[PDB]
Swiss-Prot record:
The gene is vacA. The chain holds residues 388 to 844 of 1287 of the full protein. This is Vacuolating cytotoxin autotransporter. It comes from Helicobacter pylori (Campylobacter pylori). The signal peptide, cleaved at the inner membrane, guides the autotransporter protein to the periplasmic space. Then, insertion of the C-terminal translocator domain in the outer membrane forms a hydrophilic pore for the translocation of the passenger domain to the bacterial cell surface, with subsequent cleavage. It comes from the Bacteria. Induces vacuolation of eukaryotic cells. Causes ulceration and gastric lesions.
Length: 447
């Protein structure tokens, strides 16, 4: 079985085994010059390959080759079996013009760093099942992968260089996934790095952090799904322009999308908020409009949040108190917008039409106090509401508004529009509650 070898140096082509495991140890694989840097091949016809040490070029983890010379590593596992696993238990770094090709059933890596390199090719096109990667750092990288699980994608930019980027150059199918995408800050004013996909049917991303002067172009991926978080990499102070492009984009259940003037979003197909939340950032008294090229779906449920005693909002506007008054802030524009309640499988059927149900899930906050609708379960909620809309006697004498307890009170004067073409908000000022004022609704009550 196992052929174990501490270290394989080349000096200024092919090591083929046939064994159920080729294990390379801590010495790793060292490639050389233009005499024997120009390609190195490590194969196992029959079994697996495990590398427990780094790839070196001219004796350095750094590496580095000329434009007229590439250093190419090739690992081919299970060549004659199609059941080979190639596992690299050491982080790998590839310097400039250093390429890596792996053929296998399964290819597993810790880190792959091409951040200090340039014109690196990761050729996984002969991987027939799955590539799993812990940490992938790209800059000028041709990532020729079909089916992958990448835990962390770190996309760097290329200084003031032009026409260099992270290229997903194979069709990615419908099964791949990236747990975290982190766009790094690029060079100011330019977009000298970022992600381009050749094509695919569906990509799942759990958390996606964008940064200015970098981009993620997934126009050629029919559908992208964000399962958890889509936000700035510096949410306390987002800045500049990050360019995010999609065909269809879906925000999954309880996922949170932060959307501002700093996140230039192109959505050429459809946008679906499937029971998630879009937080719109106000800068300059204004919001960014989420422009949808084709159809939008706002999907919601009837869960009452334990944290609030009301429906979770699909849209949140914090620092709404800063909104310019007397003007329409258009939040979403699509060719056609649908509204759907997913949990209508409860209570009987509502009398409230879908647009109006949706407007209950459209929230405005005054510094993290809800101001569009006051959810009152007790005296302390009266104060908070008093605080939200700036009514001093609600704060000072809450037992004066005892009539609000058990009730959702609508602050009209924030006016909301949710029709088949847009969602928008028009702010005039704050109303005040009346004993017999109406604008009130009995709170939901789950278990």
């Amino acid at each position: 079985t196992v052929v174990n070898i501490d270290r394989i140096n080349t000096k200024a082509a092919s090591l083929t085994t046939n064994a159920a495991h080729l294990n390379i140890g801590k010495g790793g694989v060292n490639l050389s010059n233009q005499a024997s840097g120009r390609t190195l091949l490590v194969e196992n016809l029959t079994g697996n390959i495990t590398v427990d040490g780094p790839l070196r070029v001219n004796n350095q983890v750094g590496g580095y080759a000329l434009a007229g010379s590439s250093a190419n590593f090739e690992f081919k596992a299970g060549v004659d079996t199609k059941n080979g696993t190639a596992t690299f238990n050491n982080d790998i770094s590839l310097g400039r013009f250093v390429n890596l090709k792996v053929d296998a059933h399964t290819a597993n890596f810790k880190g792959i760093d091409t951040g200090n390199g340039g014109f690196n090719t990761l050729d996984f096109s002969g991987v027939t099942n799955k590539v799993n990667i812990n940490k992938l750092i790209t800059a000028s990288t041709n990532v020729a992968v079909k089916n992958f699980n990448i835990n962390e994608l770190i996309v760097k930019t290329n200084g003031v260089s032009v026409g260099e980027y992270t290229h997903f150059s194979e069709d990615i199918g419908s099964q791949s996934r990236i747990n975290t995408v982190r766009l790094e800050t690029g060079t100011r004013s330019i977009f000298s790095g970022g992600v381009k996909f050749k094509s695919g049917e569906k990509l799942v991303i759990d958390e996606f952090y964008y940064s200015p002067w970098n981009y993620f172009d997934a126009r050629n991926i029919k559908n992208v799904e964000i399962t958890r978080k889509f936000a700035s990499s510096t949410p306390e102070n987002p800045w500049g322009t990050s360019k995010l492009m999609f065909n269809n984009l879906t925000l999954g259940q309880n996922a949170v999308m932060d959307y501002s003037q700093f996140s230039n979003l192109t959505i050429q197909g459809d946008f679906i908020n499937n029971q998630g939340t879009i937080n719109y950032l106000v800068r300059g008294g204004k919001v960014a409009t989420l422009n949808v090229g084709n159809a939008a779906a706002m999907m919601f449920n009837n869960d009452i949040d334990s944290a609030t005693g009301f429906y979770k909002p699909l849209i949140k506007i914090n620092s709404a108190q800063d909104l310019i008054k007397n003007t329409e802030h258009v939040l979403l524009k699509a060719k056609i917008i649908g509204y759907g309640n997913v949990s209508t499988g409860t209570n009987g059927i509502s009398n409230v039409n879908l647009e109006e149900q949706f407007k209950e899930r459209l929230a405005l906050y005054n510094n993290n106090n809800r101001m569009d609708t006051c959810v009152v379960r007790n005296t302390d909620d009266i104060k908070a509401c008093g605080m939200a809309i700036g009514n001093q006697s609600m704060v000072n004498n809450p037992d004066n508004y005892k009539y609000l307890i058990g009730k959702a009170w609508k602050n009209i004067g924030i006016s909301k529009t949710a029709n088949g073409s847009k969602i928008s908000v028009y702010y005039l000022g704050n109303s005040t509650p009346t004993e017999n004022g109406g604008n009130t609704t009995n709170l939901p009550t789950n278990t």
